[PDB]
């Protein structure tokens, strides 16, 4: 009894998405989804994601996280059906991962973004929304819009966290 993924008709797409302006480092300031839980003796720690636009218009996408120590994982997001949407490249290479979808919901490129993800993995549907910031903090107002958007997708307050800013790893 995991919360079902919302229909896609409920997830907006950023109008006139600009791939070149979305490049760069984004810090995950907010995180919400059906497998995310407000854990208090091990609160989630902030991580970063770096997007890099290639000649073929896919992104190299690199996640940097603290764990023992630092992990850097690089993946490929391939432009999907409509601008702002992507699929995961080389999906054959991820075991038990059946599908993966990304949709940029909104962004102003130089301050924040909200991005929606939905995947099917070991035969289960998982989704999440990240609130990306170009810095490690954002306004209260942008946090509230993120919370409201998340609730609009069926998530209660417990499935929404704000990762604590850190210095190890994520900046190198």
Phi, psi (5° rounding) for residue 151? -60, -30
Structure tokens, 54: 């290639």
Buried b (16+ CB within 10 A) or exposed e, 148-161: ebbeebebeeebbb
Contact 27, 134 (CB under 8 A): yes
Contacts of range 64-70, beta carbons closer than 8 Å, 24 or more positions apart: 64/169, 64/170, 65/169, 65/170, 66/166, 66/168, 66/169, 66/170, 69/169, 70/168, 70/169
CA distances from 113 to 90, 121, 125 (A): 25, 25, 23
Specify burial of residue 59 (Cβ count, 10 A radius: 0-12, 13-18, 19+).
Answer: buried
Task: Give the start-to-end residue ranges of the domains of the chain.
Answer: 1-172
Contact 111, 133 (CB under 8 A): yes
Among candidate residues 139, 127, 132, 140, the one with its CA nearest the CA of residue 106? 132
Q: In the 8-state DSSP scheme, what is residue 4?
A: P
Structure resolution, Å = 2.7
Q: Selecting from 2.60.40.10, 3.40.50.1000, 2.40.128.20, 2.40.30.30, what CATH number does the domain 1-172 have? A: 2.40.128.20
- Annotated binding residues for enterobactin, written as ranges, equal 100, 128
Tell me the HSE value of 115 on the side-chain side, using a 13 A CA sphere: 21
Q: Nearest-5° angle of CA 163, CA 165, CA 171?
A: 120
Question: What residues does 48 pair with on adjacent strands?
Answer: 27, 64
- Annotated binding residues, written as ranges, equal 47-49, 100, 119, 128, 132
- Annotated binding residues for a carboxymycobactin, written as ranges, equal 47-49, 119, 128, 132
Measure the CA–CA gap between 165 and 152, rounded to whole angstroms: 26
Among candidate residues 50, 23, 1, the one with its CA nearest the CA of residue 109? 23
| Ordered DSSP codes for 34-102 | TT----SSSPPBP-EEEEEE-TTSPEEEEEEEE---EEEEEEEEEE-SSTTEEEETTGGGSTTEEEEEE
């Amino acid at each position: 009894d995991l919360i079902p993924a919302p229909p896609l008709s409920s997830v907006p797409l950023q109008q006139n998405f600009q791939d070149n302006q979305f490049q760069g480092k984004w810090y995950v300031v907010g995180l919400a989804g059906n497998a995310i839980l407000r854990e208090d003796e091990d609160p989630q720690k902030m991580y970063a994601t770096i997007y890099e636009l290639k000649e073929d218009k896919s992104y190299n996408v690199t996640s940097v996280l603290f764990r023992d120590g630092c992990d850097y994982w690089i993946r490929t997001f391939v432009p999907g059906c409509q601008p702002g949407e992507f699929t995961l490249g080389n999906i054959q290479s991820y075991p038990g991962l059946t599908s993966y979808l990304v949709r940029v919901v909104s962004t102003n490129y130089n301050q924040f973004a909200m991005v929606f993800f939905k995947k099917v993995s070991q035969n289960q549907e998982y989704f999440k929304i990240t609130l990306y910031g170009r810095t490690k903090e954002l306004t209260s107002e942008l946090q509230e819009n993120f919370i409201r958007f998340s609730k609009s997708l069926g998530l209660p307050e417990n499935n929404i966290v704000f990762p604590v800013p850190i210095d190890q790893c994520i900046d190198g």
